[PDB]
Symmetry: C2
Subunit: 348 residues, 2 copies
């Protein structure tokens, strides 16, 4: 009859729904406009939802949560018409994490894995939260997967410390071949996946970056990589080249908060300030985990302006991929990159 | 009558003398010319020393240890003339460390502390060794110290993990004032101290850097700092300025292995490639240990050439000081900087 099954939103990294107390805790990245929050509620069929006290700051597509304690009540009325449970929605500010462990999955996402990072706030610092994105919602559309384990991006149990992320380049079948999307690289990235572009503009579907308030120096982690056996270009097998995985991170200037880089301009936009990237020559294929440390280097002499950093003008992105040229459909089905325990080393 | 009490040398980071077996293990930094080793032996009064088998590679002031196992025998004959113990001298290649813990002191240096770092070799890597330098041999000349604890550079027991280094700016007395060397900053650095310049050219006395074969990204550590009460310039008290400590590291190109930077050109030489340095604004005065992380930044767009790095053309230096402008005699007697557990984060 009436309830809130899922809560999403433009700036929502994570939304915890406590069905017992009817409390929804929504974590958003610092910098989000609290006065203009766009939220999306998934309710049972025929049920309606309405904010209890509308306020002037509200618009027809957003809610104003700017006033402390950034908490608003909502009533869900059944189609049935008889049940009207009241939910409290609390918006909580968070920052991107420093450590990424790949231990947690969204319990709402059952068809494929969706990873998130979370560290509770303390007296010293606010909540550290991130919902990682991938190409999984696009891969779903291929009809190729049977369950979560067939996807290009999957959580595995025997990580370096706890669980880890497994990225595997997958075969997209005949239809994939027809639309020239011959392979599906496994990826994990900070930003958003626009599924309405997944097939029409796969590189535009991957948007990278969230507001970051620290100065990054290095990205450190552990990985294992094994290349697939058959390297292909435009769907056809090629000899003489072995596939390689990819790990990189970016810091770029976003004049206004709506600006994001994507798969088509991440390495060519003049907004890019810092870039850390694993050297192809340094990648090994081993059954043992290897530690890597990469350096956030200045792009064309650009540097981080502290005042701009403080005002949220820079966005950080981290991208992991099983096939370095996979976004262009060059790579080998079966290339598998496992990553675990990433650490962002920042100026301190 | 006859023995080897101390063994030193131009390229000798550390020399262990095992009096029981009469074995001297000399660790030198990778890059040293094994065919031209200059060694200095301290023997009892009147005793003489001579290499057992001279070889063609020998010169009148150096020894050739290039041939494996880089081991030569030496006989020490007493003035007494009756005792001739034979010592075996083994030269061992080492690299600069990654971790600096300030736990060990040279047992030969009793008047003032001389710190060294040591990690034994393994199947994976060679010995990691460094003898740290300081201004202590110069301070000795002031007559101001009673024992090791009065020096500007001293090991203290209650470090962050084990023992730590305590750098304290000291008063140089009336003679110091006469020669315009009004204060003595406590320092610790990678390189060499030329005591014959200690008074005549104190900045030239501090030579920085040893051959380093990795790409440094960041220097990380723990510190506590407390400024002295009276800030002075040219021996005279000044109000309106509080003293600050300093921590920095450099990577510079050395065309030939004899090139070193010093106190007069470390921040102006065109050989400088990378510089990491703590921001004055980021230093706090606290009774609690604080972690710092500084970034090796490109100087004037310069970058590390891998082939040159591999051939030992770059030297790394790390410098710690209780008074940032202490080399120019601006600072406060009593400024105290404790450092512990430094870690060099490198590309991997
Ligand atoms: Cl969840
Ligand atoms: Cl010793």
């Amino acid at each position: 009859e009436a309830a809130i099954d899922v809560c999403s939103g433009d700036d929502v990294q994570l939304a915890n729904i406590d069905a017992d107390s009817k409390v929804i805790n929504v974590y958003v990245n610092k910098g989000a406009d609290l006065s203009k929050q766009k939220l999306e509620f998934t309710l049972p069929q025929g049920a309606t939802i309405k904010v209890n006290t509308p306020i002037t700051g509200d618009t027809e597509s957003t809610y104003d949560f700017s006033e402390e304690p950034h908490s608003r009540k909502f009533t869900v009325t059944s189609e049935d018409g008889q049940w009207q449970p009241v939910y409290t929605v609390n918006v909580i500010l968070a920052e991107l994490p420093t450590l990424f462990k790949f231990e947690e999955l969204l319990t709402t996402s059952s068809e494929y894995d969706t990873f998130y990072e979370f560290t509770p706030a303390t007296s010293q610092e606010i909540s550290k939260v991130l919902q990682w994105s991938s190409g999984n919602p696009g891969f779903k559309l291929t009809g190729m997967a049977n369950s979560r384990i067939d996807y290009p991006t999957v959580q595995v149990a025997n990580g370096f410390k706890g669980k880890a992320v497994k990225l595997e380049t997958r075969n997209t079948g005949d239809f994939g071949a027809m639309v020239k999307m011959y392979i599906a690289a496994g990826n994990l990235f900070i930003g958003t996946f626009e599924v309405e572009n997944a097939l029409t503009n796969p590189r535009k579907a991957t948007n990278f970056g969230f507001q970051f308030y620290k100065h990054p120096i290095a990205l450190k982690g552990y990985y294992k990589f094994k290349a697939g056996e058959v390297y292909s270009v435009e769907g056809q097998p090629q000899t003489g080249k072995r596939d390689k995985c990819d790990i990189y991170a970016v810091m770029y200037e976003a004049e206004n908060n709506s600006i994001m880089l994507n798969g088509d301009n991440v390495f060519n936009s003049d907004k890019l300030v810092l870039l850390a990237r694993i050297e192809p020559e340094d990648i090994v294929e081993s059954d043992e985990w290897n530690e890597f440390t990469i350096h956030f280097e200045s792009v064309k002499g650009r540097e981080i302006d502290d005042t701009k950093l403080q005002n949220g003008k820079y966005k950080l992105g981290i991208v992991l991929s099983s096939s370095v040229d996979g976004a262009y459909f060059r790579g080998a089905v079966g290339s598998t990159l496992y990553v675990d325990e990433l650490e962002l080393i920042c100026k301190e």
